[PDB]
Amino acid sequence: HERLTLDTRLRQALERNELVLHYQPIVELASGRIVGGEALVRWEDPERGLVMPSAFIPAAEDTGLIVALSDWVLEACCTQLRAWQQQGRAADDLTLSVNISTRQFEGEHLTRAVDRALARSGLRPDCLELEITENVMLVMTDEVRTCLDALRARGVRLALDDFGTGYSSLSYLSQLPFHGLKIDQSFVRKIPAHPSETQIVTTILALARGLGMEVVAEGIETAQQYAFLRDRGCEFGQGNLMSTPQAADAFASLLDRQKAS
Amino acid sequence: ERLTLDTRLRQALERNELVLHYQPIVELASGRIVGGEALVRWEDPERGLVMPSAFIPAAEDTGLIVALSDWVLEACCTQLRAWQQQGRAADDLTLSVNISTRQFEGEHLTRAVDRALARSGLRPDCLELEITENVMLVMTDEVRTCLDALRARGVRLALDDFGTGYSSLSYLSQLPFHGLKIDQSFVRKIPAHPSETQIVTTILALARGLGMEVVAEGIETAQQYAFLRDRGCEFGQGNLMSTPQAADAFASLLDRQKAS
Numbered sequence: 001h002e003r004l005t006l007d008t009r010l011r012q013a014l015e016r017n018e019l020v021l022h023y024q025p026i027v028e029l030a031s032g033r034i035v036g037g038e039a040l041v042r043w044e045d046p047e048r049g050l051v052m053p054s055a056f057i058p059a060a061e062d063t064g065l066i067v068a069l070s071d072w073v074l075e076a077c078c079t080q081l082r083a084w085q086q087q088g089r090a091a092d093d094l095t096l097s098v099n100i101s102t103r104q105f106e107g108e109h110l111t112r113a114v115d116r117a118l119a120r121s122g123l124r125p126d127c128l129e130l131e132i133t134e135n136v137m138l139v140m141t142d143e144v145r146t147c148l149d150a151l152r153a154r155g156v157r158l159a160l161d162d163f164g165t166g167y168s169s170l171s172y173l174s175q176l177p178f179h180g181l182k183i184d185q186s187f188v189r190k191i192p193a194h195p196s197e198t199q200i201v202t203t204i205l206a207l208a209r210g211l212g213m214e215v216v217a218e219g220i221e222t223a224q225q226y227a228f229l230r231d232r233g234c235e236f237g238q239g240n241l242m243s244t245p246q247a248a249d250a251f252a253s254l255l256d257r258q259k260a261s
Numbered sequence: 262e263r264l265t266l267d268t269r270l271r272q273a274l275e276r277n278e279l280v281l282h283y284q285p286i287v288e289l290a291s292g293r294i295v296g297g298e299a300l301v302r303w304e305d306p307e308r309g310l311v312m313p314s315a316f317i318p319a320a321e322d323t324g325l326i327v328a329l330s331d332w333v334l335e336a337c338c339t340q341l342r343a344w345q346q347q348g349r350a351a352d353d354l355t356l357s358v359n360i361s362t363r364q365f366e367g368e369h370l371t372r373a374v375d376r377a378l379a380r381s382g383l384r385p386d387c388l389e390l391e392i393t394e395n396v397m398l399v400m401t402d403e404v405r406t407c408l409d410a411l412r413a414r415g416v417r418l419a420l421d422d423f424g425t426g427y428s429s430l431s432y433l434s435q436l437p438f439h440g441l442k443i444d445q446s447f448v449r450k451i452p453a454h455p456s457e458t459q460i461v462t463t464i465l466a467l468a469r470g471l472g473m474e475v476v477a478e479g480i481e482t483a484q485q486y487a488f489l490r491d492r493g494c495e496f497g498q499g500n501l502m503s504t505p506q507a508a509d510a511f512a513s514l515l516d517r518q519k520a521s
C-alpha cells in the first residue's frame with residue numbers, strides 16, 4: 001500500500017528529472033591521487049529534500065524500476081565524465097563507476113544500455129566501470145554469462161561490490177571476467193582491532209592478487225584503517241576520511257587542485 | 262510386486278545390511294594416514310555392494326536419511342573406539358562422517374552426536390563432521406546453534422564438496438568450520454586443465470587466508486599430489502593413496518604404518 005506510492009513517486013522523480021549524482025573520490029592509497037569516482041544517486045525531492053539511496057534503491061530493485069533509473073545513471077555519468085574531459089579537468093587516467101542491479105541482465109538489457117550511454121556521450125568505454133553485488137553469482141544464467149562477455153569485449157571493467165557480505169561460488173569467481181573487488185565497509189570499519197574482519201580483509205587482498213584483480217577498500221574512516229590497508233598492499237580506497245560523496249562541481253574542484261600539484 | 266526401495270531400506274537397517282568403508286586421509290608432507298572418511302554402502306543380498314548414490318538420495322527425499330545417518334554416526338564411532346581399544350589407532354587418528362543438511366531439523370544432529378558418542382565412549386575430539394558447502398545458503402539460527410553446540414563439545418567440522426557450492430566470506434570467518442574439502446571434480450583435472458587449476462589455487466588462498474585446513478579430495482596422480490603439497494595443502498584423500506577400504510583392510514593399513 002504505502003510501498004506502491006513510494007515506487008510511484010520514485011517513478012515521477014525519473015519523469016521530472018529530480019535525480020542527481022554525487023561522486024566519491026576513489027584514491028590510490030600510496031600516492032593519494034584521485035584516480036576514480038563512484039557515482040551515487042540521490043533524489044532531490046521538492047517535498048522532502050535530499051533523499052538517500054538506501055531509502056529507495058532496494059524497493060526499486062524489487063519492482064523493476066531499477067532498470068530505467070540505472071539507464072539514467074549510466075547516461076548522466078558518462079556525459080559528466082566526457083564533459084570534464086572536454087573541459088580539461090579529468091586526467092586521462094580517470095574513470096567513473098556506476099552501481100548495477102542484477103535486474104539489469106533480464107533480456108540482456110545491460111549491454112544495450114551501456115552501449116547507448118557510451119554512444120550518446122562519446123565516452124571511451126574503458127573510462128566507465130561497473131559495480132555489482134557478489135550475489136550475481138547466485139543468479140548465473142547463460143543470459144548473465146552473455147552480458148559479462150559483452151562487457152569484457154568492450155573493455156568495460158566489472159567489479160564486485162560489497163565483497164564479503166554476499167555469496168560467491170569459488171569456481172565462478174575464478175572464471176568470470178571481473179576485474180576488481182571492493183572490500184565492504186563493514187569489514188574496513190573494524191580493522192585492525194577485530195581478528196575476524198581483519199583476516200577477511202587480508203584474505204580478500206590475497207584472493208585478488210591470485211585472480212589478477214584490483215582492490216578498492218570502501219568506508220575508510222580513520223588514519224589507522226588507511227595505514228593498515230596501504231601497508232598490506234590494498235591499492236585503492238574510498239572513504240569519508242579522504243572525501244565524502246561530492247556534488248559534480250565540488251568533485252571537479254578536487255580534480256582541479258590535483259592537476260595544479 | 263517388488264518391494265519399494267523404501268521398504269528394502271527399512272529392512273536393511275533392521276537386518277544390519279549397511280556397512281561402512283573408510284578412505285584414508287593423508288598428511289601430504291609425510292604421507293601418514295591421520296584420518297579416514299566413513300563412507301556408507303548397502304550390502305544388499307539381491308545385488309551385492311550397492312553404492313550410496315543408489316539409496317542416499319532416495320533416503321533424503323523420504324526422511325529415512327535421519328535414521329540412516331544415526332546408524333552411520335554410531336557405527337563410525339563404535340569402530341574408531343574398537344581400533345583404539347585394540348591398540349591399532351594412534352592418538353591422532355580421527356574419522357569423519359558425512360552429514361546431510363536434513364539432520365538439522367529439530368536440532369536432531371546434536372542429539373544424534375551425543376547418543377553416538379555416549380554409546381561408543383568415543384572422545385568428541387576424535388570425530389569430525391563433513392557438511393556440504395551449500396549449508397551456507399540455509400544458515401538459520403537452528404543450524405547456527407547445532408554448529409556452535411558441536412564445536413563446544415570439541416567435534417571438528419569441515420565443509421565438503423568445496424568449490425561446487427556457495428560461501429559467505431563473513432560466515433567462513435565466523436562459523437566454526439575448521440577445514441574444507443576441495444571437491445574431486447576440480448582436483449582430478451589439475452594441472453592439465455588451467456581453469457580447474459585456478460579454482461584450486463583460489464580455494465587454497467581462501468583457506469590459508471582464513472586459517473582453515475584443507476583436504477584435497479580425488480588425488481589420482483603423483484603430479485596432483487606434488488602440486489598440492491608444494492602449495493601448502495595440508496591433507497589429501499584419493500585413489501592414488503588408497504580407495505575406500507572395508508574395516509579390516511583399513512585396520513591393516515594402520516598396522517603397517519605403525520610398524521614404521
Ligand SMILES: Nc1nc2c(ncn2[C@@H]2O[C@@H]3COP(=O)(O)O[C@H]4[C@@H](O)[C@H](n5cnc6c(=O)[nH]c(N)nc65)O[C@@H]4COP(=O)(O)O[C@H]3[C@H]2O)c(=O)[nH]1
Pocket residue numbers: 024039040041052053054057066070073099100101161162185218219220221238239240241245
Ligand atoms: N559511513 C560511511 N559510509 C561511506 C564511507 N565512504 C563511503 N560511504 C558510503 O558507502 C556507499 C557506497 O557504496 P555502495 O556499496 O555502492 O552502496 C550503495 C549502493 O549499493 C546503492 N546505490 C547508490 N547509488 C546507486 C545507483 O546509482 N544505482 C544502484 N543500482 N544502486 C545505488 O546504495 C548504497 C548506499 O549508497 P550511499 O548512501 O550513497 O552510501 C555510499 C557512500 O556514501 C565512509 O567512510 N563512512
Ligand SMILES: Nc1nc2c(ncn2[C@@H]2O[C@@H]3COP(=O)(O)O[C@H]4[C@@H](O)[C@H](n5cnc6c(=O)[nH]c(N)nc65)O[C@@H]4COP(=O)(O)O[C@H]3[C@H]2O)c(=O)[nH]1
Pocket residue numbers: 284299300301312313314317330333358359360361391421422445449478479480481498499500501504505
Ligand atoms: N573419482 C574419484 N573419486 C574418489 C576418489 N577418492 C574417493 N572418491 C569418492 O568420493 C566420495 C567421497 O566423498 P564425498 O564428497 O563425501 O561424497 C559422498 C557423500 O556425499 C555421500 N555419502 C557417502 N557416505 C555417506 C554417509 O555415510 N552419509 C551421508 N549422508 N552421505 C554419504 O555420497 C557421496 C559418494 O560416496 P561414495 O560413492 O562412497 O564416493 C566417495 C569415494 O568413493 C578418487 O581418487 N577419485
Ligand SMILES: [Cl-]
Pocket residue numbers: 382384
Ligand atoms: Cl578414550
Ligand SMILES: [Mg+2]
Pocket residue numbers: 038099131161
Ligand atoms: Mg558501489
Ligand SMILES: [Mg+2]
Pocket residue numbers: 161162182184185218
Ligand atoms: Mg559497496
Ligand SMILES: [Mg+2]
Pocket residue numbers: 298359391421
Ligand atoms: Mg564427504
Ligand SMILES: [Mg+2]
Pocket residue numbers: 421422423442443444445478
Ligand atoms: Mg566432497
